[PDB]
């Protein structure tokens, strides 16, 4: 074990936590948990943190490439958007953790081939009205990349017909 060689990731990633406290400005509620850049260090982190399904409503996890803040305002996000799925109440226990882990594996495994460079990160929102999972990409008008990421992501999630997936620019989200 003292000579074990870890398996490198293409990118260094940062895992963030968001705590719901409406008294604070939104970014003030972000907390960096840790960063990693190997397969084994990914699992060491994942294996020592709470499952998404056990977070308090109003909290988030986000996994973003090192140097990209998990917010619309980042240079790498402001022209981008997200591939979003929304779950119902029953699906929190049956699917949220599985879908989130699959999302993490798509990110760290660079599953979108020559378009994985358009990936910024992913977010899971634990919400009473319906949990959300999304992959954030860097440019909504990189339509080849957006298509490829969306198509592969949906296949990897294995979504049933009742859980749909769509893309939205952050500019449109911010303006609602």
């Amino acid at each position: 074990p003292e000579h074990y060689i870890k398996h490198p990731l293409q990118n260094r990633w940062a895992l963030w936590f968001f705590k719901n406290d409406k008294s604070k400005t939104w970014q003030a509620n972000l907390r960096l948990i840790s960063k990693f850049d190997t397969v084994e260090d990914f699992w060491a982190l994942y294996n020592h943190i709470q499952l998404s399904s056990n977070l308090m409503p109003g909290c988030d996890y986000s996994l973003f490439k090192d140097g990209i803040e998990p917010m619309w305002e980042d240079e790498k996000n402001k022209r981008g958007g997200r591939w979003l799925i929304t779950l119902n109440k029953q699906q929190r226990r049956s699917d949220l953790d599985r879908f989130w882990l699959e999302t993490l594996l798509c990110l760290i495994g660079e599953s979108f081939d020559d378009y994985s460079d358009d990936v910024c990160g992913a977010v899971v929102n634990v919400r009473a009205k319906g949990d959300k999972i999304a992959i954030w990409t860097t440019e909504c008008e990189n339509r080849e990349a957006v298509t490829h990421i969306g198509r592969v992501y949906k296949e990897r999630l294995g979504l049933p017909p009742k859980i749909v997936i769509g893309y939205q620019s952050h500019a449109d989200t911010a303006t609602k």
């Binding site: 907390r31 840790s34 982190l45 760290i108 660079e110 990897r156």
Partner: protein, 35 residues
């Protein structure tokens, strides 16, 4: 060469010893970072 990994490869590492060593320097976030 880009470092690309399929899901089965990644999952195979989840419980090897290196993946069970608690990371250093974690913040104290109750019920999030499991201590």
């Amino acid at each position: 060469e880009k470092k690309r990994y399929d899901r089965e490869f990644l999952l195979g590492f989840q419980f090897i010893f290196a993946s069970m060593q608690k990371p250093e320097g974690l913040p104290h976030i109750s019920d999030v970072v499991l201590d």
